[PDB]
């Protein structure tokens, strides 16, 4: 399983695992391949912000892989 290589990747890995109910998730994990849907996307957006990273639901649907999602995130102001 692929370790995160940036702070944003590491935060999103942890949030993916928490939202999807998994123990740990790799930096190459696909949110919808792992069981994501509209409800869980909503939760991912909220919990990512709590972890310091601003994303949208549209970001998740367009970039469901952790590493790709981390690249469009913005740090919370």
Residue numbers in the entry: 3521 to 3597
What are the paper's exact sentences on this?
Non-ribosomal peptide synthetases are important enzymes for the assembly of complex peptide natural products. Within these multi-modular assembly lines, condensation domains perform the central function of chain assembly, typically by forming a peptide bond between two peptidyl carrier protein (PCP)-bound substrates. To address this, we report the structure and biochemical characterization of complexes of a PCP domain bearing a stable analog of the acyl acceptor complexed to the acceptor site of a C domain from the NRPS that biosynthesizes fuscachelin in the thermophile Thermobifida fusca. The C3 domain of the didomain resembles other members of its class, comprising a pseudo-dimer of CAT domains with bridge (R2923 to T2944) and floor loop (A2843 to L2858) regions.
Given that the PCP2 and PCP3 domains of the fuscachelin NRPS are highly similar (65% sequence identity), and that PCP domains can act as both aminoacyl donors and acceptors for C domains, we rationalized that the arrangement observed in our structure is a valid model of an acceptor-PCP-bound C domain. Importantly, the residues at the interface with the C domain are conserved or highly similar. Furthermore, computational docking of the PCP3 domain onto the acceptor-PCP binding site of the C3 domain showed that it binds in an almost identical orientation to the PCP2 domain in the structure of the PCP2-C3 didomain.
